[PDB]
Amino acid sequence: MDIKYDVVIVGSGPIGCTYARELVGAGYKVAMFDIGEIDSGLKIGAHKKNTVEYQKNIDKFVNVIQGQLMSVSVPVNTLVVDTLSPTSWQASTFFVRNGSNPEQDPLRNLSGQAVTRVVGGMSTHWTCATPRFDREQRPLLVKDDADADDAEWDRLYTKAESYFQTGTDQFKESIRHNLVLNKLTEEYKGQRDFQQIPLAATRRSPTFVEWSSANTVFDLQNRPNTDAPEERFNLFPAVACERVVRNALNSEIESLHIHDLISGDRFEIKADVYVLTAGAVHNTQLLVNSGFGQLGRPNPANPPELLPSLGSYITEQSLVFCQTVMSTELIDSVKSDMTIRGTPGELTYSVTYTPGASTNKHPDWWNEKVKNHMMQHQEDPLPIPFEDPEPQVTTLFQPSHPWHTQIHRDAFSYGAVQQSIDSRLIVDWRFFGRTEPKEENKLWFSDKITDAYNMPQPTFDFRFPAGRTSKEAEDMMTDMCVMSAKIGGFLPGSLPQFMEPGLVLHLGGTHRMGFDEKEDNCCVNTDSRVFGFKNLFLGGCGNIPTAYGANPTLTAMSLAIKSCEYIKQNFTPSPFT
Amino acid sequence: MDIKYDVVIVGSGPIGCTYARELVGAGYKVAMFDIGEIDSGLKIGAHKKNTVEYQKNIDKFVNVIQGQLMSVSVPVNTLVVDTLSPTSWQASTFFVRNGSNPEQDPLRNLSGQAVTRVVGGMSTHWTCATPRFDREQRPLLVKDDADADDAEWDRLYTKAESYFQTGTDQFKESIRHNLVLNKLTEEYKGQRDFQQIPLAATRRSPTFVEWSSANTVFDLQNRPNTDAPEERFNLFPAVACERVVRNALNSEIESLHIHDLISGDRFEIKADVYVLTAGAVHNTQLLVNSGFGQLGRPNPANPPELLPSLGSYITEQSLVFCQTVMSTELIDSVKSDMTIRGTPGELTYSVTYTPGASTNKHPDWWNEKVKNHMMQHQEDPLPIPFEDPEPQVTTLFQPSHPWHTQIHRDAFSYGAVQQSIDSRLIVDWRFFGRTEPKEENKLWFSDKITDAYNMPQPTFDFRFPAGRTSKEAEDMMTDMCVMSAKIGGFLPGSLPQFMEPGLVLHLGGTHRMGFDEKEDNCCVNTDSRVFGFKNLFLGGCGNIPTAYGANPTLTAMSLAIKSCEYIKQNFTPSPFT
Amino acid sequence: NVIQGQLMSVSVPVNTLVVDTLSPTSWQASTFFVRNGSNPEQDPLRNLSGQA
Amino acid sequence: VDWRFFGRTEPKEENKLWFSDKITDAYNMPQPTFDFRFPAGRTSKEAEDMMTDMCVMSAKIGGFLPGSLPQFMEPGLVLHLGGTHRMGFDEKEDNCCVNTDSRV
Numbered sequence A, B: 001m002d003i004k005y006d007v008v009i010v011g012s013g014p015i016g017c018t019y020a021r022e023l024v025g026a027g028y029k030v031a032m033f034d035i036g037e038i039d040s041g042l043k044i045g046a047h048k049k050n051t052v053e054y055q056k057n058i059d060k061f062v063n064v065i066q067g068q069l070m071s072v073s074v075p076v077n078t079l080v081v082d083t084l085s086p087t088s089w090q091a092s093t094f095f096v097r098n099g100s101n102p103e104q105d106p107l108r109n110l111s112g113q114a115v116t117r118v119v120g121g122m123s124t125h126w127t128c129a130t131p132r133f134d135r136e137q138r139p140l141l142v143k144d145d146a147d148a149d150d151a152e153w154d155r156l157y158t159k160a161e162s163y164f165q166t167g168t169d170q171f172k173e174s175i176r177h178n179l180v181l182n183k184l185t186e187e188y189k190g191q192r193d194f195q196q197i198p199l200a201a202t203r204r205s206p207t208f209v210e211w212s213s214a215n216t217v218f219d220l221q222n223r224p225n226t227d228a229p230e231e232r233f234n235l236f237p238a239v240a241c242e243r244v245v246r247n248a249l250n251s252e253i254e255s256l257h258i259h260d261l262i263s264g265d266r267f268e269i270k271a272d273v274y275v276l277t278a279g280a281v282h283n284t285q286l287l288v289n290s291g292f293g294q295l296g297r298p299n300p301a302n303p304p305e306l307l308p309s310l311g312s313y314i315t316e317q318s319l320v321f322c323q324t325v326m327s328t329e330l331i332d333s334v335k336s337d338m339t340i341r342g343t344p345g346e347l348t349y350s351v352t353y354t355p356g357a358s359t360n361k362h363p364d365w366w367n368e369k370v371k372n373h374m375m376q377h378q379e380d381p382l383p384i385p386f387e388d389p390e391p392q393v394t395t396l397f398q399p400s401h402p403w404h405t406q407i408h409r410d411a412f413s414y415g416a417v418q419q420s421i422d423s424r425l426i427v428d429w430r431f432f433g434r435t436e437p438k439e440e441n442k443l444w445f446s447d448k449i450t451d452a453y454n455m456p457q458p459t460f461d462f463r464f465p466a467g468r469t470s471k472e473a474e475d476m477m478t479d480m481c482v483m484s485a486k487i488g489g490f491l492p493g494s495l496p497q498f499m500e501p502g503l504v505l506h507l508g509g510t511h512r513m514g515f516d517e518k519e520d521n522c523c524v525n526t527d528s529r530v531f532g533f534k535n536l537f538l539g540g541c542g543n544i545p546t547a548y549g550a551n552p553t554l555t556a557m558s559l560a561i562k563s564c565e566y567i568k569q570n571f572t573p574s575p576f577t
Numbered sequence C: 001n002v003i004q005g006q007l008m009s010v011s012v013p014v015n016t017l018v019v020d021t022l023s024p025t026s027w028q029a030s031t032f033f034v035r036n037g038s039n040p041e042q043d044p045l046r047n048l049s050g051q052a
Numbered sequence D: 001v002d003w004r005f006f007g008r009t010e011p012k013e014e015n016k017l018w019f020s021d022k023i024t025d026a027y028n029m030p031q032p033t034f035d036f037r038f039p040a041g042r043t044s045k046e047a048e049d050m051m052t053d054m055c056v057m058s059a060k061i062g063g064f065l066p067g068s069l070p071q072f073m074e075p076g077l078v079l080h081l082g083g084t085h086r087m088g089f090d091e092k093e094d095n096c097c098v099n100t101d102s103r104v
């Protein structure tokens, strides 16, 4: 292991991989460190649901997700257990137990917020939804020129869509998808538009979708190698990056202090450029542990020397959720073009349609699928083929409905009573609200309590702001109740509800971007460079300073691409030696 | 891809890897197929709990286990959901839904039986307990010579323990471990012996234990390689092995038919030797798909041509479980040697002991750990150090207590109310009973219903036998209640209970061993060779024909070692040319 | 049910259960205040919670 | 079959029923408050021995019904509260409130 690199990247999630793809491919000698380890098969950092076993039983994948989410801040537990035996040891107080954080006010938390420490970060389990932000959700890249701003965003998004292999066509011939899409299109004719959720994925077969991940962006293989003989890249897993060392003038980073978790050794690693892509919480922790912002409980009478906005203006989306069970009317519509003769299971049972007839309400391919299912499976009471893919429907955020929507299926933990309902009938509804950035909403770090890696313990001070955020969040729940009813009634056990704050994991604004440090209350400029520092960049959702409803990864990636362009103009790659 | 080898092995679990280690090492050209894929990191087939992240947060590992256990047979669901909206499509019958098996009687099932399809099989997540069977639980290898039989078992188990890196010392300096060990030792003085559970694991540091797996046994890297330039081995993941082809005389296997799940291609693989190590359920399924035993619901009027005992005499252990919260008496005993002056948090707080003093209850190393925890963490009300390892205690099966015992901790999902209890206080209790082999207890395969891989669907017909099995099961429950009370009272929410049948996953006897096919109602001989067939061997817990309570893997491995000795004496490795 | 309808708990400590899935528009407490006949004198770990 | 085993609790001065001077109940009376723990020593040992005895004795009749596994009940759910105004021969010597005629 060398002492000296051109570029060091902290974190191997999709944003770290965006920096790696750009900088490795432009000839820089790059090292990337991740506190977590390789565990996605031979494709390093790839999507864990791309195994044949998970494509066959998607519902088991929820356990993979839960297995790699570690709660950020867990308040001291105050549950009374008063049925212990009189011989068991019993507390006299609610003391600090089981990794809980005594700094945490349980009523001002993001209890759902969690982090993932594996190579490839959260992109080894994510849902892969990559919509663009419209103007109202999107940070400015060009001031006082809307057309140049639009064109810069379109350029960046288009490259990012390339890196993720985003597409809107992978579910085009699913009967359920089209059944839902067409009904909502009709119901909202001239009011709202519906389309497929943009998904980072490529269909390989009618029963296999290769979901994208960090690996799609950059394969994380050491270079040079055979396919890439001129490139230079080393990945170091199980390495905790602990701090960047500031020079006395606060104008440059001099090294990156690391702790090898296998060997136990500590090093100082030196590079021309330091990139932090450790996620929205862990970028902030690393910065704070390096003397940026303020350690300990916020004190507005003792302002921090550096980046006073760091860890303020934090945003997290409101999320509402329910599931539905498809209406009788919709289910009967699936077989509207069929002529049915006889009795199921008998010899003279016949299901037929006339292909191409003008009276047919469905296309030939749909009718063929339905006829074959009904004919080959006469014991089954539903017209939807067993292997029909799930719906993947959205109407994107607009000013008259300012929430993102997903009307679809992902991995779900059904209760035994719910497993009673045929899976083909079930549709998930998830509406995501935007949250106004407010100075009082903070992520801070204890000066006494430490986490499992002996770093200052993250603590939230968060409430959904009064005013627009709150009114919109409740209007959003109503909208889901109204819209979902057009498809079917709620599934018992999955009734309309707000999710635990932060369970969405779309945390933003912890190290937010803007044009001017003071005027825009921010930490990085539009090249993602830390103000004042020549050689320190941050990537990820923590850069996004706006109120957004849509899934933010694609936007973070777009910013990271722009960041790499600055880097490419301002730093010279070492010569191949 | 070659289609010709000396030895082909179906399954990459620890039993498949026992054959690979032996036969690759003896110079055979070996191929191994697994229907599952590589996903344990760069160490192929290794234990998934070996990451730093799981060493720090062990309770999250329960999710990893659940994500790779697929239920074998789920009966048709009859739960009534009668609060759907009137508009939702609603069933008139409890029709076949959601992969359920209409052949399965819900009251004669092993509902908790599940399989894992991943490289390394279940040894990627297992608890690593590897006790030997005493005579009463163990199949005979030598008839009418108890001493020779003991000597042969000792030789085999010794080699098996070396392969797994079994030890009884990895937890010797845990305070919690010794606290429990010494108390049970005292309480049962003269009546029962206690020791550490024998574990397949190597301690690397005070906070890291490297758990063994299939990888420990055999590293599963393609050979030849730098480290083994004269060996020959190829692993082929995502390949469903479907049938072995019998010759007309039923004396030899002629090929293995396989299905590549990625490409969709089918091949006939040729070998001199065919080894089936697909697990107790799937070995049986592959054999039945190949014309052994009987397909469909058992029909005694229509005897199977081959291996009529295949799928009969199946055994599964009864399992009782509770948790306890350590007694005040035991907790106070942890600090019995301490002198405490003043009160915690203050300046004059002192905790001291006298090293080597003859009136001390505890060794110096224990007193020093207690002393330092209490002095450095004066806010904490317990004398047990935060990183103190868990107990790993057993009293092994004996005639006067015919069940295996584990008094320990492994992966567990605590309810929010239980998370209220400090984890240092909690001990898990699991006692495993032996189940008599009975002809009527059967694993059979449907001739109409198929599973997720289009293979005949497994169906159980099982009840715990009346008589000794049942009486001993209830006596075991009582023994757990009596013995756990000596350590502490039950933890609310983990009260003494039988676990769902088969959730233990120690299924045996599906393709059982004996001396004589007819007289011993069995499928393989003591070399694990299928009767009548020169070149077909079965490995795994399915071979074990006895009633056993101890964890069976180490025993199955020992049988596979003996099987390899036969193969090495009867088959010649091809010339490495 | 007859029994439960005429058993009134003697001393119920202040409730500290966290409900954090209220809608943002709903009135939300800042503290665990004295609510619903709870007794702030009561140490929840030194109670007879079942006494009625 | 239901199994209920009831243990005896040593009377200890520190175990108290008292009444708030500020909080009031539904009848506007001083709010009762407990300060109670099962005493260490004999009470606690017997309680746990009692649990074990129920596990051993019940097994002779049948195994446990799932959902009604052996458990201690919430303290006081039993409603056999005693000693709040206790009898004895001598007020000071026997730490008591009424005599053997139940007279205060």
Ligand SMILES: *Cc1cc2c(cc1C)nc1c(=O)[nH]c(=O)nc-1n2C[C@H](O)[C@H](O)[C@H](O)COP(=O)(O)OP(=O)(O)OC[C@H]1O[C@@H](n2cnc3c(N)ncnc32)[C@H](O)[C@@H]1O
Binding pocket: A010, A011, A012, A013, A014, A015, A016, A017, A033, A034, A035, A036, A065, A116, A117, A118, A119, A120, A121, A122, A123, A125, A126, A127, A128, A129, A130, A239, A240, A241, A242, A277, A278, A279, A280, A282, A283, A286, A505, A539, A540, A541, A551, A552, A553, A554, A556
């Ligand atoms: C979990 C989740 C997330 C998710 C989702 C569904 C689930 C269940 N669905 C999404 C969706 O459909 N659309 C979308 O845009 N995002 C979705 N997500 C969130 C998404 O996965 C994240 O936004 C994205 O992965 C963030 O990428 P980024 O690269 O910034 O961060 P990361 O993936 O968390 O990776 C961070 C890496 O850093 C390592 N780390 C952390 N601390 C350190 C230190 N100190 N030293 C070295 N490395 C560190 C972590 O191990 C991690 O690998």
Ligand SMILES: *Cc1cc2c(cc1C)nc1c(=O)[nH]c(=O)nc-1n2C[C@H](O)[C@H](O)[C@H](O)COP(=O)(O)OP(=O)(O)OC[C@H]1O[C@@H](n2cnc3c(N)ncnc32)[C@H](O)[C@@H]1O
Binding pocket: B010, B011, B012, B013, B014, B015, B016, B033, B034, B035, B036, B065, B116, B117, B118, B119, B120, B121, B122, B123, B125, B126, B127, B128, B129, B130, B239, B240, B241, B242, B277, B278, B279, B280, B282, B286, B505, B539, B540, B541, B551, B552, B553, B554, B556
């Ligand atoms: C899950 C589990 C298991 C377990 C345990 C705790 C848990 C939660 N604790 C144990 C303990 O402490 N002590 C012990 O002895 N065992 C414990 N176990 C059970 C143990 O893991 C199993 O007994 C053991 O792994 C069995 O090994 P074996 O090699 O015989 O079988 P396997 O691990 O199931 O691997 C089978 C492989 O075969 C592949 N397969 C299945 N079907 C096919 C087909 N048709 N074609 C090709 N390959 C096939 C599977 O994918 C699997 O990988």
